[PDB]
C-alpha cells in the first residue's frame, strides 16, 4: 500500500491511497501485460463478522484513509498513509499533532507513533518515547509493546496565503516531497 498527496497553484487538492494489498501482491504478473496482480481477496473475513465476508462482486473492507482537514474554510492539511489497520491511528496522530500540539507538518511527520487496536490488547509503540513515560503507561495498566516502524505519511499543509508546506515520512527511504 502507498499514499501520495498533491496540491496545485489554484488550491485544488488530491489525496490518493492505493495498493496490491501485500508487497508486490500475489507476485503474479498477468500474462504478457507486465501487470502485477493484487491479493486483495485476503482482506475479506476468512471465516470481523459476516459484514466483511467473502461474497461475489463485493468490495473487501479497507483501512485506507486519504484525508483532508479544513481550517477557516480552506483546505489546510492533506495526508494519508499505508499500514493496514494502523492507518487509522497514523492519520489520527497527524491530525492531533497538527491541531492540538501545533507541530509543523515535518515535525508531525517525524514524531514517534503509538497504536492500540483493541485486539491484541497491547499499546504498540515505535522507538522514541521516554522510558519514564512508558513506565507510567504500564502502571496505568497498558501493555507496552515496542515494534516495527508504522506507516509512510506523505503530507502537505496549506497556509491561508497559498504557501505550501510538505513532508515525506523518514520511514521510507527514497521518498520525496517537492514543489515549485
Amino acid at each position: 500500500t502507498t499514499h501520495y498527496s498533491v496540491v496545485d497553484k489554484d488550491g485544488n487538492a488530491v489525496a490518493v491511497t492505493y495498493t496490491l494489498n501485500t508487497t508486490f501482491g500475489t507476485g503474479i504478473v498477468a500474462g504478457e501485460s507486465g501487470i502485477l496482480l493484487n491479493n486483495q481477496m485476503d482482506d475479506f473475513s476468512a471465516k470481523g463478522g459476516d459484514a466483511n465476508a467473502v461474497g461475489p462482486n463485493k468490495r473487501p473492507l479497507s483501512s485506507m484513509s486519504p484525508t483532508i482537514v479544513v481550517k477557516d474554510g480552506k483546505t489546510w492539511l492533506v495526508t494519508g498513509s499505508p499500514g493496514g489497520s494502523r492507518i487509522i491511528t497514523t492519520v489520527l496522530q497527524m491530525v492531533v499533532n497538527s491541531i492540538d500540539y501545533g507541530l509543523n507538518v515535518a515535525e508531525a511527520t517525524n514524531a514517534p507513533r503509538f497504536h492500540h487496536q483493541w485486539l491484541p490488547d497491547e499499546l504498540r509503540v515505535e522507538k522514541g518515547f521516554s522510558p519514564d513515560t512508558l513506565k507510567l503507561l504500564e502502571a496505568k495498566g497498558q501493555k507496552v509493546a515496542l515494534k516495527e516502524a508504522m506507516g509512510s505519511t506523505q503530507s502537505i499543509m496549506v497556509g491561508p496565503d497559498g504557501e505550501l508546506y510538505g513532508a515525506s515520512d523518514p520511514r521510507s527511504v527514497d521518498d520525496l516531497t517537492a514543489g515549485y
Binding site: 501520495y4 498533491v6 496545485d8 497553484k9 487538492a13 488530491v14 489525496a15 490518493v16 491511497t17 492505493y18 495498493t19 508486490f24 500475489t26 507476485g27 498477468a30 500474462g31 504478457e32 501485460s33 496482480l37 493484487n38 491479493n39 481477496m41 485476503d42 476468512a46 470481523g48 467473502v54 461475489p56 462482486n57 468490495r59 473492507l61 484513509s65 486519504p66 484525508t67 483532508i68 482537514v69 479544513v70 481550517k71 487509522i88 492519520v91 492531533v96 499533532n97 491541531i99 492540538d100 500540539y101 509543523n104 515535518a106 517525524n110 514517534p112 483493541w118 490488547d121 499499546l123 503507561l137 496505568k140 505550501l164 510538505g166 520525496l176 516531497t177 517537492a178 514543489g179 515549485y180
Partner: protein
Amino acid sequence: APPVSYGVEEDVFHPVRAKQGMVASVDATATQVGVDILKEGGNAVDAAVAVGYALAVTHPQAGNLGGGGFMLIRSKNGNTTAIDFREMAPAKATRDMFLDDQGNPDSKKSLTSHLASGTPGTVAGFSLALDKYGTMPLNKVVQPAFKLARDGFIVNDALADDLKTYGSEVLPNHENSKAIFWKEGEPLKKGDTLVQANLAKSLEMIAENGPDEFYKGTIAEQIAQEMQKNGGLITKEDLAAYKAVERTPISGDYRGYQVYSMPPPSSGGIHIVQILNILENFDMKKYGFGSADAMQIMAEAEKYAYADRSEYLGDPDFVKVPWQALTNKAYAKSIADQIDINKAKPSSEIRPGKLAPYE
C-alpha cells in the same frame, strides 16, 4: 485549540516549502513526474493520475494497475468528494472459497494463488477522476510512466531491498514475473536498470484506447487467460462489469476544523472521525505530545473504536453501516466518560457499543 505552526527556522524538522504546487509521494521519480505535470499546467487531479501511473512502474511494491485504492478530492471551490476504486470480488467468488478440507482458512490460497485476486479498479478509478475533475487527456498523464517502463530506470535502495525481502517470496515462483524482476538468478540490485517492456505496451495501449483497453481490450484478455489457465476466477465479464464509484466523504468537526476522509468500504474514515469526537472531550493540548496522559486517553479511545469497527463495517452496497451513530458526538461523549486517565480498561471488558440510542 492552540495556534497552528507552519514551521519556523528554530525547529528541528523543516517542511519543504513551495509557493505554487506540491507533490508528496513514496518515490522521488514519481514525485518529480507529478511536479512536471503541474508545471505544464495540469491541475491536482491531472498530476495525481500521472503520479499514480508513474508509481505503477517505479514502485511495483504497491503502485499498480492491477490493484485498487481510494481517492479524496477537494476542489478550490470547496466541493469534496471520494472515489472508490477498491477491487471487487469475482462473480464466481464464494464464501468458503478459501477453506481447506478441515474447514480452516488456507492463507496460501488467499495470498499467493490466482484465487487471491480481486478485479482491479485503479485504471477505472483514475479515469473516472481524470474525466470529471481533470483537464488533461489520459495519454498526456500516462506518457511519463510509459517512458519509464519502456526506457527503464535505476533500481534504488527501496526497490532493491523490497525485491530481496518481499519479492523473493513470490516473484521468482512465476516465470513471467521472474523474467521481469529477477536477473542472473537473483533479484535486481541497486544500480541495476529495470526495463518493463510488457508494461510499457499496456500503458501505450491504455493511453491510446482509454480505460476500455484494460477492462474490455487486450489487457482484459491477458488477465482472463492468466486466470483461466491457472485456476483463477476473474473473467472478462468481471472486468467488463467493474465500476469505480464516486461516494460522499465521511466527515466531522474537531475543535472548529472540518475533517474529510474515506467512507465505507473504507473503515478508517469513520473511525478517525469517531476517535476525534472522543478526544474532543479532552484538553489534549494540555497533556502534550509524548505524555503518558495523552497516550492513555488516545489508547483508550482507540480500543472502543476498533471494537465497533470489528462489528459494524462493510461494503455499503451489501451492508447498511450505522455511520450516523458511529460519528455521533453524544455517542463519543458516552465513550469519553468511560476513560480513566489513571487506569486502562482491559480489551476483554470492551465490546462493540450499543448504537440504538444514537440512531
